[PDB]
Structure formats: structure tokens, C-alpha cells
Design a protein around this ligand. Structure first.
Ligand SMILES: [Cl-]
Ligand SMILES: [Cl-]
Ligand SMILES: [Cl-]
Ligand SMILES: [Cl-]
Ligand SMILES: [Cl-]
Ligand SMILES: [Cl-]
Ligand SMILES: [Cl-]
Ligand SMILES: [Cl-]
Ligand SMILES: [Cl-]
Ligand SMILES: [Cl-]
Ligand SMILES: [Cl-]
Ligand SMILES: [Cl-]
Ligand SMILES: [Cl-]
Ligand SMILES: [Cl-]
Ligand SMILES: [Cl-]
Length: 433
């Protein structure tokens, strides 16, 4: 017997969308399952009618590394030497998947994150670990600008977002490059900003995606008068951290993208893990009020952890869809790019968390309610400032996967629905007709 009040006229941040990644040969592992299962995986990830409807696609900028193998390894870089450019589309094994999802599903937000600059730019001469040489800052600035221009002029792919560095705090056993927040400001102020201005780059910069979810790596660039001009989006991951406000980022009026999170420690594919990531979306939208939220892989060959929404077995050429694909789909399928979060009772009762969104251009709306508790909860939703005739519920539980339910009549801007325990329900409706 709890009440949720959804206000139509109290709005918050604009949602840029949701996405996943297929970096490190995982885009080719989808094709290795055959054309039939490949289209099924594309449909489960990007379809807005029977899939998660992800609107952003995250890829890796080829660095030319020699680590890993064909199942999980790096791609060739378009600039293997300082004096050699190699615009061979076969170097990027993610291009065929991008062309397919952009044509069939209209996914028009392309983000390429740089895990590491080429080995000839690094202080250790390798894409694994190390840092960017200070005498190579201009080379890496041109490296980023030439990639955005030629991916359009040579390959016909419009790169809308560029990630300057993936986890600048960490040196890994794979493609990685360590940065300090001061070195990032020097790179932005003295190199990236003048180069991107000179090349007329219109792609938005996703700032160095910190492993932990904080803005500490972007504070220096945000407070610099020249660097702040192209800190369009402050990117960050949520590995081992929690969702917190970004004070300096919000003061500068920039965007916040949570570009990667997954379960590298456990292997839970049930509704319990699915509600963990739905709760992470709710926390990302209410406390930080960010704009975009990503998972790590959409489909990967790792069947032993939760690094991907779809676990593919390359031996038997089969895949298994975890519950987290549908729980995240409770947000991603309906909340399209350009939507706007509106006010809603964020915690009406114990273990129930609600957010509300709307499309300012069409009048459509969506109310996502989570119930990660053990008890059934009857919730009465009062719609303040808008009076639709009905809403359509979509529920994901231990026995349901984004399942559409019977329409619920809205009587005098109010409707009721009992949330099953360990479930998530999204109510979709339209105010214009
Ligand atoms: Cl879209
Ligand atoms: Cl390579
Ligand atoms: Cl080519
Ligand atoms: Cl290397
Ligand atoms: Cl500095
Ligand atoms: Cl500063
Ligand atoms: Cl900085
Ligand atoms: Cl500033
Ligand atoms: Cl800009
Ligand atoms: Cl911005
Ligand atoms: Cl959580
Ligand atoms: Cl859309
Ligand atoms: Cl509950
Ligand atoms: Cl009203
Ligand atoms: Cl119905």
C-alpha cells in the first residue's frame, strides 16, 4: 500500500542512451556462431521490439598489439608506424557489425575507446602497460583526429564519440596506458583542443574513463579554460566503486557516461544478478543523474563470468542469454536517445526503486520500478501533470523476460500494480495520439 507520484513538469537530465561493447574480437565471435545465431544476437541487443534496444555501440580503436589470441586479442592499428598509415578496414573486426546494426536497427551513436596508443608512442614500446611519451602528445592528437575523419571518408562510419583513454589509472596485462590527471590536462589543453579545432572535429570527447566511478581524473581539465571546451562527456567505469555525484562535471554543464561495468568475479545469470544491474541504473540516474549507461560486452565467449550479457560457447556454437539483458532492457528498450528523466518517488517502500522518463518531442513516457525484495508490493502510481488513458507493463522476473502484460487502465491519472518479489516492471504509455 505505497504511493508513487510521477510529475510531468519537474524534469532532470537528458538520456543519451544505453549501449554495450564488442571489443577484443567479440564481434567476430558472434559471426563464428553462424549467420542465423548472429542475427539472433544482433536482435537481442539492438531490436526495440523484441530485444534490449541498445542505442550506443562501444568499440576499441586498434592499437596493433601482439598480446592475446584470436578469441580475445587486439586489432591492428591504422597507423602502425609514425610515417605509415594503413587504412585497411580489415584491421577493425568491428566494422561489419557496425554497418549491420546501423542499417537494420538505426543505432546512430558510435563510440570508439582507445585502450592504448600504438607501441611506437608508448614509453615502454608496447601497448601493454606504460604511458604515452610526452614527445608523442601531438602524434596521438593527430592519431585521434585522423581516425575520426578517415573512418568517415574511407570506411563511411561516422564516429560520434571518442574515448581518449580506457582506465588511465591501470596498467593491465593487455592494451593499457597510464595517465595522470595533470598529463590529461596538458594533452587536452595543448594538443587535443587545438588539433580538433584545426580539423573541425565535431565528435564529442568521452574523457578518460576512470576505472572507479569518480571525476577525479577530469577535475584538472574541467577547471582549465581551454581544456574544458572539449570535455564534452566525463566517462568512468564502476568496477569496485559506487555511484556518486560528479560535482565539478555538473557545474561545467557536461555529460556523464558510465561506459563499462560487469561481473568479472562471479557467474550469476539469474534474476538476482539482473536486478543488481537494474539497481545500478537506478542509482546512476538518481544520485549522479548521468546521461548514458553501458555494460561491458553484449555477447562474449566467456561462459564462466558475467563480463557479457550473452554467453557464447564457441565449441558448440551456442549462446545463453542472462537475465541481466532483459533487466537492463527494461530501461534501454523504451528510454531512447533524447528522452528526459522526470520526477518519481525513488523509494516508495522497502526494496522498491522507481524512476520515470518521458520523450519531450512525442509525449511518450516510461516508468521503471524495481522490486529486489522478498515481498509482493502493491504500488499506486499517481500521474501529476499528464493523464494518459492506459499503460502497458513489461516485466522481467525469474520466469519472465521483458514480457508484455495486459494493458492497465488509468483512472483519473492513477493506476495500481503489484510488483512481484525479485522482479522489475516498466509501464509504457503515450500522452499524444
Ligand atoms: Cl537508437
Ligand atoms: Cl595487431
Ligand atoms: Cl579497406
Ligand atoms: Cl605492443
Ligand atoms: Cl595540470
Ligand atoms: Cl585546472
Ligand atoms: Cl584532467
Ligand atoms: Cl573552466
Ligand atoms: Cl566540443
Ligand atoms: Cl557536453
Ligand atoms: Cl546494485
Ligand atoms: Cl530510437
Ligand atoms: Cl519488497
Ligand atoms: Cl494533475
Ligand atoms: Cl491488454
Amino acid at each position: 500500500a505505497s504511493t508513487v507520484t510521477v510529475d510531468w513538469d519537474t524534469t532532470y537530465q537528458t538520456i543519451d542512451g544505453f549501449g554495450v561493447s564488442e571489443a577484443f574480437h567479440q564481434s567476430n565471435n558472434i559471426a563464428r556462431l553462424g549467420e542465423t545465431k548472429q542475427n539472433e544476437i544482433y536482435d537481442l541487443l539492438f531490436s526495440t521490439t523484441d530485444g534490449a534496444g541498445f542505442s550506443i555501440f562501444r568499440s576499441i580503436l586498434g592499437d596493433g598489439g601482439t598480446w592475446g589470441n584470436a578469441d580475445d586479442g587486439p586489432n591492428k592499428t591504422m597507423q602502425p608506424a609514425e610515417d605509415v598509415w594503413d587504412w585497411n578496414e580489415s584491421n577493425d573486426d568491428q566494422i561489419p557489425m557496425i554497418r549491420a546494426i546501423q542499417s537494420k536497427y538505426g543505432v546512430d551513436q558510435i563510440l570508439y575507446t582507445v585502450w592504448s596508443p600504438p607501441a611506437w608512442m608508448k614509453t615502454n614500446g608496447s601497448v601493454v602497460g606504460g604511458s604515452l611519451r610526452t614527445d608523442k602528445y601531438q602524434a596521438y592528437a593527430t592519431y585521434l583526429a585522423e581516425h575520426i575523419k578517415n573512418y568517415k571518408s574511407k570506411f563511411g562510419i561516422e564516429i560520434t564519440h571518442i574515448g581518449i583513454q580506457n582506465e588511465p589509472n591501470l596498467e593491465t596485462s593487455y592494451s593499457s596506458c597510464r595517465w595522470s590527471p595533470e598529463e590529461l590536462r596538458i594533452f587536452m589543453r595543448d594538443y587535443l583542443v587545438p588539433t580538433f579545432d584545426k580539423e573541425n572535429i565535431t565528435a564529442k570527447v568521452v574523457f578518460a574513463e576512470n576505472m572507479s566511478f569518480n571525476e577525479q581524473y577530469a577535475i584538472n581539465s574541467l577547471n582549465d579554460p581551454i581544456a574544458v571546451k572539449r570535455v564534452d562527456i566525463v566517462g568512468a567505469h564502476n568496477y569496485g566503486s559506487s555511484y556518486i555525484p560528479f560535482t565539478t562535471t555538473k557545474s561545467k554543464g557536461k555529460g556523464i557516461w558510465m561506459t563499462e561495468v560487469s561481473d568479472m568475479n562471479g557467474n550469476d545469470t539469474t534474476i538476482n544478478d539482473g536486478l543488481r544491474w537494474a539497481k545500478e541504473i537506478h542509482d546512476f540516474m538518481t544520485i549522479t543523474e548521468g546521461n548514458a549507461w553501458f555494460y561491458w560486452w553484449g555477447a562474449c565467449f566467456k561462459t564462466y563470468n558475467g563480463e557479457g550479457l550473452i554467453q557464447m560457447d564457441l565449441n558448440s556454437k551456442t549462446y545463453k542469454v542472462a537475465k541481466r539483458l532483459y533487466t537492463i532492457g527494461q530501461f534501454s528498450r523504451f528510454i531512447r536517445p533524447g528522452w528526459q528523466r522526470i520526477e518519481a518517488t525513488k523509494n516508495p517502500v522497502s526494496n522498491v526503486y522507481v524512476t520515470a522518463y518521458k520523450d519531450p518531442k512525442t509525449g511518450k513516457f516510461a516508468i521503471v520500478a524495481i522490486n529486489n525484495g522478498w515481498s509482493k508490493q502493491s504500488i499506486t502510481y499517481t500521474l501529476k501533470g499528464f493523464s494518459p488513458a492506459s499503460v502497458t507493463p513489461y516485466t522481467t522476473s525469474s520466469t519472465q523476460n521483458l514480457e508484455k502484460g495486459s494493458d492497465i487502465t488509468v483512472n483519473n491519472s492513477s493506476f495500481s500494480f503489484e510488483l512481484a518479489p525479485n522482479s522489475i516492471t516498466t509501464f509504457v504509455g503515450d500522452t499524444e495520439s
